[PDB]
Write an enzyme that holds these catalytic residues in place. Structure first.
Site, PDB file in Angstrom:
ATOM      1  N   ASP B  96       0.309  -1.137   0.134  1.00 55.42           N
ATOM      2  CA  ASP B  96      -0.038  -0.311   0.065  1.00 55.42           C
ATOM      3  C   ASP B  96       1.248   1.342  -0.250  1.00 55.42           C
ATOM      4  OD1 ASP B  96      -1.805   1.857   0.458  1.00 55.42           O
ATOM      5  OD2 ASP B  96      -2.837   0.880   2.372  1.00 55.42           O
ATOM      6  N   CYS B  99       1.692   2.745   3.478  1.00 58.39           N
ATOM      7  CA  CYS B  99       2.002   2.742   4.375  1.00 58.39           C
ATOM      8  C   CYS B  99       3.369   2.859   4.493  1.00 58.39           C
ATOM      9  CB  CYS B  99       1.838   0.823   4.208  1.00 58.39           C
ATOM     10  SG  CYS B  99       2.295  -0.176   5.748  1.00 58.39           S
ATOM     11  N   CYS B 102       5.916  -0.082   4.118  1.00 60.92           N
ATOM     12  CA  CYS B 102       5.957  -0.148   2.302  1.00 60.92           C
ATOM     13  C   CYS B 102       7.029   0.186   2.092  1.00 60.92           C
ATOM     14  CB  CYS B 102       4.801  -0.417   1.651  1.00 60.92           C
ATOM     15  SG  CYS B 102       3.053  -1.438   2.774  1.00 60.92           S
TER      16      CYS B 102
END
Ligand SMILES: OC[C@H]1O[C@@](CO)(O[C@H]2O[C@H](CO)[C@@H](O)[C@H](O)[C@H]2O)[C@@H](O)[C@@H]1O
Lengths: 215, 215
Positions: B96, B99, B102
């Protein structure tokens, strides 16, 4: 009726003392174990976790929980029952004497009773079977007057150690089989598990709406 | 002979656009919904939630997961692939762009690659298909060069709104079917889901241990 393949599978899986009964699905057996209900094909090859639902009718029925209700009722002589004078509802509560919400609930027992709600307790140590919670609850359940022992426990007074042939580990296991993961957990007559604490007023509201009373 | 009984049950349960596939158990169908996998009897009468295990061998096999891995690989042309020059491992990552973890992972892409780990991305907006994260990642996956668009988005550049022949709804649904709880979520060649971030060094050790690189 040859559950041999299943038993062999359970052994390789290292599951002991499991109860193997038929399911409504042909070729699949209901396997009740100490940490859940399993559905296993007669040949031992395939395994699904419970619950099993019957979605044939207008509303889904939790087959697994209906079956567990009978296990629940065979424990009635081991229940600590707080009876409401005039009884509108009966709930079975899995409780842990170390749980603040179970305390909060128990403190109001006369209020639940006043509202027609009978409460029946089974022992469920959140921290599991090897906890002090378990040992202390074992002593409570072994007393001649479980209600008095339970009251005094909840009032924080000291708990005299006792042991007898009553095995509340079966209470914990039934609780795990129902899918319960915390206390207090409410079991309705109708089979539904309702997690968490609700005060007398909210409890009665919930019960009058969800729990049919032919009365 | 058809799936009419099951479909009628799916209708009553408000399950739309499910995909009815075979199962290893006679009289049971694998039903892939948008939210996961169900096992339903041929007569539409009974329903069990996945996952299905094959426990016939020395070790249990998650049959459900092997089926999801098949759908995973069917999306290979939709993946953003960062290939290691001397490839020793391949991981698929649900990611994502909103995120923090991430981003932390993606910043070290050169380091994963240098260790022989090829990373392939699928989009998983944690906030669902109606979110801005969905729009931006749909936009990314629609570009002729997904790699550049993904890089530039991780560099906090403005993502130009863009549409094409497909969105990323299938990525999200697959992620939900895998039961992913957050991002990044790692899928190994062997169907295993490994939740959360791991640095390049921890990642390699994890792969060399759990995911034999036969080459
Ligand atoms: O509409 C996108 C759709 O096209 C495919 C090929 O069928 O991918 C092509 O288009 C992508 C988006 O612009 C490019 O990133 C990709 O390199 C190109 O092959 C599908 O993968 C995609 O669903």
């Amino acid at each position: 009726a040859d559950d041999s393949a299943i038993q062999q599978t359970l052994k390789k899986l290292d599951i002991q003392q499991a109860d193997i009964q038929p399911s409504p699905i042909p070729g699949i057996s209901t396997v009740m174990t100490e940490s859940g209900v399993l559905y296993i094909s007669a040949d031992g090859k395939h395994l699904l976790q419970g619950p099993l639902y019957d979605v044939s009718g207008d509303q889904p029925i939790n087959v697994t929980n209906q079956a567990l209700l009978k296990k629940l009722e065979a424990l009635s002589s081991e229940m600590i029952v707080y009876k409401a004078p005039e009884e509108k509802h009966v709930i079975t509560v899995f409780t842990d004497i170390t749980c603040g919400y179970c305390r909060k609930l128990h403190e109001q027992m006369k209020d639940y009773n006043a509202l027609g709600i009978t409460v029946r307790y089974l022992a469920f140590p959140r921290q599991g079977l090897s906890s002090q919670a378990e040992k202390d609850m074992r002593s409570i359940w072994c007393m001649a007057d479980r209600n008095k022992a339970f009251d005094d426990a909840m009032k924080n007074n000291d708990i005299s150690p006792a042991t007898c042939k009553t095995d509340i580990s079966k209470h914990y296991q039934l609780g795990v089989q129902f899918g319960i993961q915390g206390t207090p957990a409410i079991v309705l007559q109708n089979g539904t598990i309702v997690p968490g604490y609700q005060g007398p007023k909210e409890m009665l509201q919930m019960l009058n709406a969800h729990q049919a009373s032919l009365k």
